[PDB]
Design an enzyme around this catalytic site. Structure first.
Site, mmCIF file in Angstrom:
data_model
loop_
_atom_site.group_PDB
_atom_site.id
_atom_site.type_symbol
_atom_site.label_atom_id
_atom_site.label_comp_id
_atom_site.label_asym_id
_atom_site.label_seq_id
_atom_site.Cartn_x
_atom_site.Cartn_y
_atom_site.Cartn_z
ATOM 1 N N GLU A 1 -4.832 -4.473 -4.475
ATOM 2 C CA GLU A 1 -4.518 -2.540 -5.415
ATOM 3 C C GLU A 1 -5.237 -2.066 -5.672
ATOM 4 O OE1 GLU A 1 -3.640 -0.011 -3.291
ATOM 5 O OE2 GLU A 1 -3.085 -0.224 -1.764
ATOM 6 N N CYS B 1 0.830 -1.103 -0.371
ATOM 7 C CA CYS B 1 0.232 -0.516 0.528
ATOM 8 C C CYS B 1 1.306 1.137 0.080
ATOM 9 C CB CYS B 1 -1.132 -0.081 0.954
ATOM 10 S SG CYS B 1 -1.850 1.709 1.940
#
Lengths: 218, 218, 221, 221
Positions: free
Chosen positions: D211, D139
């Protein structure tokens, strides 16, 4: 009045509907699904069951009561040596090499669903875990009850066994234990707590749909 | 060279020494310990075993490997239905009322020891849990091996059964599984990791001494 | 409310005797009237330092188990406080005494230290966020009353050395911090069964027992 | 070092293709050249807000699983940052757009949102502190590269609205924060087996997949 297990079932009705009439599941009920697809499924479901047993393990650790803590432990044993009916049947019926198994990857859908049960159990109490593992068993029970009329759904030389499995008296007892457990744990929770439980229960129901989906996408 | 299981054993030698020659334990070996005291013990040990199974549950959740994850699950089953040899024997041999049981409180020593195994397992990996549960089993094995010569230690109409139990071939297999598990999990850890494991292992060894101690304080 | 049983008040009731033994412990008395020898207090704040590290971890468990941003955030602040408010109390005494930066992270916690923090950890991890709120409360509440009590000798507060400690745990900040914990626990539990309250009470007295044992071993220094 | 394989570098290698798909995603491109409609970005930062709450919890797990005060403390700061640095980025856009204080805590996370945070949580909870270091890295790292890349259009940064976001994730603070995470992971793993590295890699690519799916659903807005 309202038992929590009925209330949860109520709000899951639609989703289990879509599951029963999913091409993959209908495919099982009327012999139309191709082995390739089912093969991919039972390998994924095998990976899924390994992570599922862990949620039951979580139940052992979070139960404060020897009866329930012991019931969960039996659940774990079942998951590992009852697939020694269903999953094993099909790994040698198809031909899943011992290696090929532990070489396989779970798909994002698989992992997401198991992470979610695990995470919700770990963040909450034993009510959350009883809630998080319920969709899985209950839904398969309705699904197999339903596919149970075609007929010859049960007669089918190949898919018959799977249907037989998830509609047996043992599987049903097992689902019932989980229903009762959840009701007894919750006859005292607030409106807000039941909401949270309901949210877990539909969310896992969603993941079931997604699971059949990725299984067919095979 | 140095296997971690031998290295841990080495540093626990002294403490297990004190355990074997503790009034409570010697009391078991030569029939001198009074029932009152032993009664209090098996009730506490019962509470202790319930929390101990949870650490094994933790092993299921933290094992990444079906073999080991399954071995832990059997451990949990043993702890719950092998006391259905040892602990149950003595609850009806003495007369522990079904109610009296789940009415009992663990003592601070009891809770401390189980919290510590639990907390160290939860903060670490599956190596810590394999390490945290080892003292308990191993020590009882040496203790019973030792008490095994008096003789008539085994002949004793009352205490004989307990000694017989923890010196049997099954119990030993069980300890061996745990030894091997730990060695296989650790042949790759740094000097610093082994230190930490060693620290867990003596700490639980200390709690064993304290446990016999509070058992005699009965 | 308020014709309705409050769990925090019920918990407090059952801890009364234990906290009594604490206020009148050699070690605590020793703080209140300058009589306690620095050797013992040194040993103490070294142990308390280790203890505070593991205690932060239980508040950390509070972050993961709180489902509600406000409480999740209050716990996070608590962790920051525990790390940079000993940057009043503990740090004061490490340089006031002379605790070498090395000596610190060289120290071992004692069985009593470990046992206590293991227990709060394990009970938090096995339960919900109600258990964590209950598990960390004894510690804050009891120091509050002890400092309130030592607050009269007087010259208790005047004391050039032990004065700051007492000053610390009787301040309005620490007070507010304990109140947050009380209120949190009451809001989380206004719907729990008799049996659930019992379990929480059992957690509260147990950690209270560990506090007494803690002072004990600090004096045994 | 440095004739010796670095795990962070190896992880990064295997995520290359995925992060590529991310940089060139409709949604991300849309940010880089002002073309993305506020409706979609609104939906996004509402979701990202929910996501950031659960992400803090994984850092909280880092506090409980770090056995070492320095790292235990670095994690705590990370939680504070996640709570009061969106007090740059997320807050900017909640008043910049107009997210009612109620509307916020009224929102539901989407399956994709939940799935991602569940996974980081579960993997952290099942493993040691190496798993948590690995689980939270995609992330941070990936937003770093994405912002670095969008950093040239230019006028990407000039843009009156989307400029601040890019400015944010390319700053030297966010950078240092990602580096801490890289270094932490390398120090924790310089002794792990082939098999252990594999598992960490598998965690890293998986969160990378989440993601991409995340941007996807944000655009599907």
């Amino acid at each position: 009045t309202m038992q929590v297990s009925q209330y949860l079932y109520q709000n899951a009705q639609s989703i289990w509907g879509d599951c029963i009439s999913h091409p993959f599941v209908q495919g099982i009920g009327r012999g139309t699904l191709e082995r390739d697809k089912f093969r991919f499924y039972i390998i994924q479901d095998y990976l899924f069951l390994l992570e599922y047993a862990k949620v039951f393990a979580l139940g052992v650790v979070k139960a404060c009561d020897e009866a329930v803590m012991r019931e969960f432990s039996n659940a774990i044993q079942d998951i590992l040596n009852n697939e020694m009916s269903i999953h094993n049947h099909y790994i040698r019926e198809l031909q899943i090499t011992q290696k090929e198994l532990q070489n396989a990857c779970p798909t994002l859908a698989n992992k997401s669903y198991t992470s979610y049960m695990l995470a919700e159990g770990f963040k909450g109490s034993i009510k959350e875990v009883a809630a998080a593992v319920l969709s899985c068993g209950w839904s398969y029970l309705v699904i197999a009850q339903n596919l149970s009329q075609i007929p010859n759904a049960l007669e089918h030389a190949f898919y018959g066994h799977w249907i037989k499995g998830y509609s047996s008296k043992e599987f049903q007892a097992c689902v019932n234990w989980n229903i009762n457990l959840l009701d007894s744990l919750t006859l005292a929770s607030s409106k807000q707590e039941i909401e949270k439980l309901k949210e877990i229960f539909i969310t896992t129901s969603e993941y079931e749909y997604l699971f059949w989906d990725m299984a067919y996408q095979s």
